[PDB]
Amino acid sequence: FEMADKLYKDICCVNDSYRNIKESDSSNRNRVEQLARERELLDKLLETRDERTRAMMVTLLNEKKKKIRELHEILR
């Protein structure tokens, strides 16, 4: 057939819209990858430092408070 080559004309969408799935089955996974590996080992971790930040305060805000009571209790 001069009706054959139509199929010998798949090579377009079904090879190129496929060379398309590629950068969409790659790159769109690759982001979900990145976009997670990022924060899921960032966001919640710098926030280990939300924890560091407290004690500093505590251990060194009670710092200030003592140095009231001493004062306040040398007085008439």
């Binding site: 710098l46 430092r49 560091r52 004690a55 505590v58 009571r69």
Partner: protein
């Protein structure tokens, strides 16, 4: 029982009118009395005593109670009894009662907390923060300060960008204070050292005196810094 009195830190006649549990458990009156009545001498028990008035009267709930706030005496309670367990006693009688000395004690009380929350007690536990914390309305906003805490960094030109931001920063997308720059080839390394390190030497043609020059650091920096505090010079590219 005689613990003698573990920690004899009163001299003042306590007697208590009822009790419950706060959110955890429940202290059980005898369980109050004895948990300090042991720790120090003082008595519901018979005392014709009128020769000077340090009868401190602690209580959770009222009912039968009423008839002596409805006769002037200031109830103050309890916690303050339990909170004196914590450390020692001169816990300056801070917001915790059913008494009210309106114009004259809930007034004299607030003198001995601060503007927002905490007494000048022995303040805090990392929980006790989150306590008076999840409570707010008044808050006098930003400005300048000159001593910090465990969260600070200063302004520049996300991942890298936000690691600045995630923790005391500014950022801000023109010629300013610092540059962290994204590394590596002709591209970041060279075209970020762009001409745009050259786009700095237009300032000088401009500004009459030397337009101050900021320091320039591998992103590398932010991290190897974020990990304690900050250095700068040992850090180019």
């Amino acid at each position: 029982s005689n613990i003698f009195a573990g920690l004899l830190f009163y001299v003042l006649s306590d007697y208590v009118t009822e009790d419950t549990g706060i959110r955890i458990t429940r202290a059980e009156l005898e369980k109050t009395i004895v948990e300090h009545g042991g720790k120090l001498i003082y008595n519901v028990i018979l005392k014709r005593h009128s020769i000077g008035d340090v009868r401190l009267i602690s209580c959770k709930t009222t009912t039968e109670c009423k008839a002596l706030i409805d006769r002037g005496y200031d109830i103050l309670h309890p916690n303050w009894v339990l909170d004196c367990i914590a450390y020692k006693r001169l816990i300056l009688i801070e917001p915790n009662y059913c008494f009210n000395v309106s114009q004259k004690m809930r007034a004299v009380a607030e003198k001995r907390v601060d503007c927002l929350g905490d007494s000048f007690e022995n303040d805090i536990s990392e929980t006790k923060l989150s306590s008076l914390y999840k409570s707010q309305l008044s808050l006098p906003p930003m400005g300048e300060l000159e001593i910090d805490s465990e969260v600070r960094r200063f302004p520049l030109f996300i991942e890298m960008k936000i690691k600045l931001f995630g923790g005391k920063i500014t950022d801000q997308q023109s010629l300013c204070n610092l540059i962290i720059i994204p590394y590596t080839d002709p591209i970041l390394r060279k075209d970020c050292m762009n001409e745009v390190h050259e786009k700095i030497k237009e300032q000088i043609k401009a500004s009459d005196t030397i337009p101050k020059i900021a320091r320039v650091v591998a992103p590398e920096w932010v991290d190897h810094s974020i990990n304690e505090n900050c250095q700068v010079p040992e850090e180019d590219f």
